[PDB]
mmCIF file of C-alpha atoms in Angstrom:
data_model
loop_
_atom_site.group_PDB
_atom_site.id
_atom_site.type_symbol
_atom_site.label_atom_id
_atom_site.label_comp_id
_atom_site.label_asym_id
_atom_site.label_seq_id
_atom_site.Cartn_x
_atom_site.Cartn_y
_atom_site.Cartn_z
ATOM 1 C CA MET A 1 -52.261 0.075 28.711
ATOM 2 C CA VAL A 2 -49.778 2.922 28.258
ATOM 3 C CA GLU A 3 -46.212 1.835 27.497
ATOM 4 C CA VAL A 4 -43.019 3.450 26.165
ATOM 5 C CA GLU A 5 -39.797 2.140 24.578
ATOM 6 C CA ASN A 6 -37.248 3.265 27.196
ATOM 7 C CA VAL A 7 -34.633 0.900 25.705
ATOM 8 C CA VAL A 8 -31.590 2.619 27.220
ATOM 9 C CA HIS A 9 -28.398 1.571 25.369
ATOM 10 C CA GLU A 10 -25.470 3.639 26.675
ATOM 11 C CA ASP A 11 -21.968 3.063 25.262
ATOM 12 C CA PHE A 12 -18.688 4.965 25.539
ATOM 13 C CA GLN A 13 -17.608 7.361 22.787
ATOM 14 C CA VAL A 14 -14.256 5.509 22.635
ATOM 15 C CA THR A 15 -15.040 2.163 20.948
ATOM 16 C CA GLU A 16 -11.706 0.309 20.957
ATOM 17 C CA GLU A 17 -11.596 -1.840 24.138
ATOM 18 C CA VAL A 18 -15.395 -1.831 24.623
ATOM 19 C CA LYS A 19 -15.555 -4.909 22.351
ATOM 20 C CA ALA A 20 -12.708 -6.631 24.240
ATOM 21 C CA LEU A 21 -15.273 -8.080 26.606
ATOM 22 C CA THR A 22 -17.071 -9.459 23.526
ATOM 23 C CA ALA A 23 -14.137 -11.735 22.715
ATOM 24 C CA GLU A 24 -14.274 -13.277 26.175
ATOM 25 C CA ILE A 25 -18.090 -13.408 25.983
ATOM 26 C CA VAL A 26 -18.030 -15.385 22.727
ATOM 27 C CA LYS A 27 -15.229 -17.612 24.038
ATOM 28 C CA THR A 28 -17.396 -18.211 27.118
ATOM 29 C CA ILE A 29 -20.483 -18.890 24.985
ATOM 30 C CA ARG A 30 -18.341 -21.396 23.084
ATOM 31 C CA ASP A 31 -17.338 -23.017 26.357
ATOM 32 C CA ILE A 32 -20.920 -23.274 27.665
ATOM 33 C CA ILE A 33 -22.226 -24.814 24.451
ATOM 34 C CA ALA A 34 -19.130 -27.052 24.329
ATOM 35 C CA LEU A 35 -19.429 -28.516 27.832
ATOM 36 C CA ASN A 36 -23.267 -28.227 27.769
ATOM 37 C CA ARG B 1 6.405 -14.171 -7.994
ATOM 38 C CA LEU B 2 8.789 -11.841 -6.121
ATOM 39 C CA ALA B 3 12.107 -13.241 -4.935
ATOM 40 C CA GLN B 4 11.732 -12.097 -1.285
ATOM 41 C CA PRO B 5 8.338 -12.513 0.508
ATOM 42 C CA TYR B 6 7.484 -9.840 3.073
ATOM 43 C CA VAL B 7 4.686 -7.707 4.504
ATOM 44 C CA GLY B 8 4.255 -4.533 6.584
ATOM 45 C CA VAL B 9 1.978 -4.185 9.635
ATOM 46 C CA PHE B 10 0.611 -0.758 10.607
ATOM 47 C CA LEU B 11 -1.792 0.486 13.311
ATOM 48 C CA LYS B 12 -5.101 2.232 12.575
ATOM 49 C CA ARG B 13 -6.307 5.385 14.316
ATOM 50 C CA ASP B 14 -9.400 6.067 16.404
ATOM 51 C CA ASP B 15 -12.949 5.622 15.061
ATOM 52 C CA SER B 16 -12.388 2.734 12.671
ATOM 53 C CA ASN B 17 -14.304 3.016 9.391
ATOM 54 C CA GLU B 18 -14.124 0.620 6.436
ATOM 55 C CA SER B 19 -15.095 3.422 4.090
ATOM 56 C CA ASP B 20 -12.218 5.525 5.379
ATOM 57 C CA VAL B 21 -9.890 2.536 4.925
ATOM 58 C CA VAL B 22 -10.630 2.537 1.194
ATOM 59 C CA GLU B 23 -11.053 6.354 0.942
ATOM 60 C CA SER B 24 -8.118 7.889 2.909
ATOM 61 C CA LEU B 25 -4.536 7.045 3.885
ATOM 62 C CA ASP B 26 -4.387 9.329 6.979
ATOM 63 C CA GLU B 27 -6.182 6.777 9.186
ATOM 64 C CA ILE B 28 -2.981 4.759 9.531
ATOM 65 C CA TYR B 29 -0.385 5.722 12.170
ATOM 66 C CA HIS B 30 3.159 6.781 11.311
ATOM 67 C CA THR B 31 4.440 3.658 13.105
ATOM 68 C CA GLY B 32 5.072 0.569 10.987
ATOM 69 C CA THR B 33 6.269 -3.021 11.434
ATOM 70 C CA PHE B 34 7.908 -4.756 8.473
ATOM 71 C CA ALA B 35 8.343 -8.494 8.794
ATOM 72 C CA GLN B 36 8.786 -11.534 6.585
ATOM 73 C CA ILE B 37 5.859 -13.717 5.601
ATOM 74 C CA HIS B 38 6.075 -17.242 7.013
ATOM 75 C CA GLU B 39 3.607 -19.435 5.133
ATOM 76 C CA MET B 40 0.118 -19.029 3.734
ATOM 77 C CA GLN B 41 -2.565 -21.424 4.937
ATOM 78 C CA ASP B 42 -6.136 -20.234 4.262
ATOM 79 C CA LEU B 43 -7.608 -23.288 5.977
ATOM 80 C CA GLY B 44 -11.171 -21.957 6.342
ATOM 81 C CA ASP B 45 -11.051 -18.359 5.153
ATOM 82 C CA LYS B 46 -9.258 -17.450 1.923
ATOM 83 C CA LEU B 47 -7.065 -14.918 3.811
ATOM 84 C CA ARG B 48 -5.341 -16.374 6.906
ATOM 85 C CA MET B 49 -1.965 -14.708 6.621
ATOM 86 C CA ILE B 50 0.492 -14.883 9.550
ATOM 87 C CA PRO C 1 -4.383 -16.193 33.809
ATOM 88 C CA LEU C 2 -4.256 -15.394 30.102
ATOM 89 C CA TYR C 3 -1.403 -17.317 28.419
ATOM 90 C CA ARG C 4 0.490 -20.522 29.184
ATOM 91 C CA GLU C 5 3.624 -20.086 31.340
ATOM 92 C CA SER C 6 6.236 -22.392 29.680
ATOM 93 C CA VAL C 7 7.198 -19.598 27.257
ATOM 94 C CA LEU C 8 8.359 -17.681 30.338
ATOM 95 C CA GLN C 9 10.345 -20.811 31.275
ATOM 96 C CA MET C 10 11.847 -20.974 27.748
ATOM 97 C CA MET C 11 13.389 -17.460 27.833
ATOM 98 C CA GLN C 12 14.930 -16.866 31.293
ATOM 99 C CA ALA C 13 17.297 -14.066 32.277
ATOM 100 C CA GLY C 14 19.744 -16.452 33.995
ATOM 101 C CA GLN C 15 20.311 -18.372 30.758
ATOM 102 C CA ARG C 16 22.070 -15.200 29.427
ATOM 103 C CA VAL C 17 20.100 -15.748 26.190
ATOM 104 C CA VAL C 18 18.323 -12.373 26.346
ATOM 105 C CA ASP C 19 20.831 -10.575 24.122
ATOM 106 C CA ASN C 20 18.012 -8.080 23.316
ATOM 107 C CA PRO C 21 16.078 -7.100 26.504
ATOM 108 C CA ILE C 22 13.730 -4.706 24.625
ATOM 109 C CA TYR C 23 12.025 -7.687 22.999
ATOM 110 C CA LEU C 24 11.399 -9.141 26.470
ATOM 111 C CA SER C 25 9.986 -5.873 27.842
ATOM 112 C CA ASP C 26 7.769 -5.642 24.743
ATOM 113 C CA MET C 27 6.549 -9.223 25.158
ATOM 114 C CA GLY C 28 5.707 -8.435 28.778
ATOM 115 C CA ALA C 29 3.930 -5.168 27.978
ATOM 116 C CA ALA C 30 1.938 -7.072 25.332
ATOM 117 C CA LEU C 31 0.224 -9.034 28.111
ATOM 118 C CA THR C 32 -1.467 -5.795 29.256
ATOM 119 C CA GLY C 33 -5.073 -5.255 28.178
ATOM 120 C CA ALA C 34 -4.697 -1.525 27.470
ATOM 121 C CA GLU C 35 -6.236 0.244 24.455
ATOM 122 C CA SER C 36 -4.224 0.254 21.239
ATOM 123 C CA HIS C 37 -4.295 4.031 21.708
ATOM 124 C CA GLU C 38 -2.605 3.464 25.082
ATOM 125 C CA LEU C 39 -0.017 1.280 23.354
ATOM 126 C CA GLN C 40 0.528 4.092 20.872
ATOM 127 C CA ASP C 41 0.954 6.432 23.853
ATOM 128 C CA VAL C 42 3.625 4.105 25.235
ATOM 129 C CA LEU C 43 5.236 4.216 21.778
ATOM 130 C CA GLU C 44 5.163 8.044 21.762
ATOM 131 C CA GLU C 45 7.679 8.110 24.619
ATOM 132 C CA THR C 46 11.289 8.186 23.390
ATOM 133 C CA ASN C 47 13.568 7.823 26.429
ATOM 134 C CA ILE C 48 13.949 4.240 27.665
ATOM 135 C CA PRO C 49 13.225 4.885 31.406
ATOM 136 C CA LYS C 50 10.161 6.929 30.434
ATOM 137 C CA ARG D 1 16.918 -12.427 3.231
ATOM 138 C CA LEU D 2 19.407 -13.915 0.730
ATOM 139 C CA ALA D 3 18.070 -14.759 -2.732
ATOM 140 C CA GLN D 4 18.992 -18.460 -2.497
ATOM 141 C CA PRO D 5 18.666 -19.869 1.061
ATOM 142 C CA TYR D 6 21.386 -22.441 1.646
ATOM 143 C CA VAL D 7 23.578 -24.062 4.260
ATOM 144 C CA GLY D 8 26.731 -26.121 3.911
ATOM 145 C CA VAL D 9 27.780 -29.364 5.520
ATOM 146 C CA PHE D 10 31.428 -30.300 6.037
ATOM 147 C CA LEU D 11 33.083 -33.206 7.893
ATOM 148 C CA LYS D 12 35.391 -32.890 10.913
ATOM 149 C CA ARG D 13 38.757 -34.617 11.288
ATOM 150 C CA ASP D 14 39.800 -36.886 14.146
ATOM 151 C CA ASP D 15 39.579 -35.845 17.809
ATOM 152 C CA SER D 16 36.724 -33.329 17.707
ATOM 153 C CA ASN D 17 37.240 -30.067 19.598
ATOM 154 C CA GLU D 18 34.697 -27.237 19.451
ATOM 155 C CA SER D 19 37.242 -24.636 20.538
ATOM 156 C CA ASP D 20 39.433 -25.423 17.561
ATOM 157 C CA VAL D 21 36.406 -25.465 15.251
ATOM 158 C CA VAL D 22 35.600 -21.864 16.211
ATOM 159 C CA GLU D 23 39.280 -20.784 16.535
ATOM 160 C CA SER D 24 40.929 -22.311 13.444
ATOM 161 C CA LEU D 25 39.561 -23.516 10.137
ATOM 162 C CA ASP D 26 41.916 -26.504 9.678
ATOM 163 C CA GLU D 27 40.041 -29.026 11.874
ATOM 164 C CA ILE D 28 37.280 -29.448 9.330
ATOM 165 C CA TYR D 29 37.994 -31.490 6.221
ATOM 166 C CA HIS D 30 38.217 -29.789 2.865
ATOM 167 C CA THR D 31 35.336 -31.970 1.655
ATOM 168 C CA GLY D 32 31.914 -30.347 1.815
ATOM 169 C CA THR D 33 28.237 -30.965 1.037
ATOM 170 C CA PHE D 34 26.356 -27.783 0.053
ATOM 171 C CA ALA D 35 22.557 -27.806 -0.169
ATOM 172 C CA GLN D 36 19.580 -25.433 -0.305
ATOM 173 C CA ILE D 37 17.383 -24.820 2.735
ATOM 174 C CA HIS D 38 13.824 -26.178 2.842
ATOM 175 C CA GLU D 39 12.009 -24.858 5.929
ATOM 176 C CA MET D 40 12.940 -24.226 9.558
ATOM 177 C CA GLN D 41 11.118 -26.157 12.279
ATOM 178 C CA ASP D 42 12.801 -25.887 15.733
ATOM 179 C CA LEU D 43 10.273 -28.116 17.488
ATOM 180 C CA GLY D 44 12.238 -28.673 20.740
ATOM 181 C CA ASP D 45 15.724 -27.231 20.396
ATOM 182 C CA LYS D 46 16.205 -23.674 19.176
ATOM 183 C CA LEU D 47 18.526 -25.006 16.406
ATOM 184 C CA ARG D 48 17.010 -27.918 14.419
ATOM 185 C CA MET D 49 18.228 -27.330 10.870
ATOM 186 C CA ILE D 50 17.444 -29.875 8.155
#
């Protein structure tokens, strides 16, 4: 069956704050594994 | 060994690059922040300066 | 919420202990989430009201 | 910043009075106990010198 790798991965040209969500995401992942 | 311990804190420019950090000195901003070192720890990593 | 609020209770303007207000305005601007480029833009301004 | 960090300790004479301690230098006794500084702490008060 026909298929194609349309793995869109857009990101802003300015990569300074774009990782700021990552800090909260890892702190959240730490809190989910820590309570559960 | 030095009598007075201290360190300076600078800010890097846009598009961070480790190779530029060891290749060029223009990546750093003109602004600087001297301060005195407090105490070394290196609890887990070997470089945990304050 | 981001940081704990007792540090605001430790340095209050009515205590007359803020001999250096610019450190308090810097501590309060530090709570902003803006890009380090935006902080450098705030640093580019020279006049205090600006 | 000084090469040798130190602080003195003197003893006050009878009938303590802070205004005379900051106004005149005669209230304190000539005897003194000089010593080098270790490390600042300031756990609760902003002035907890050892």
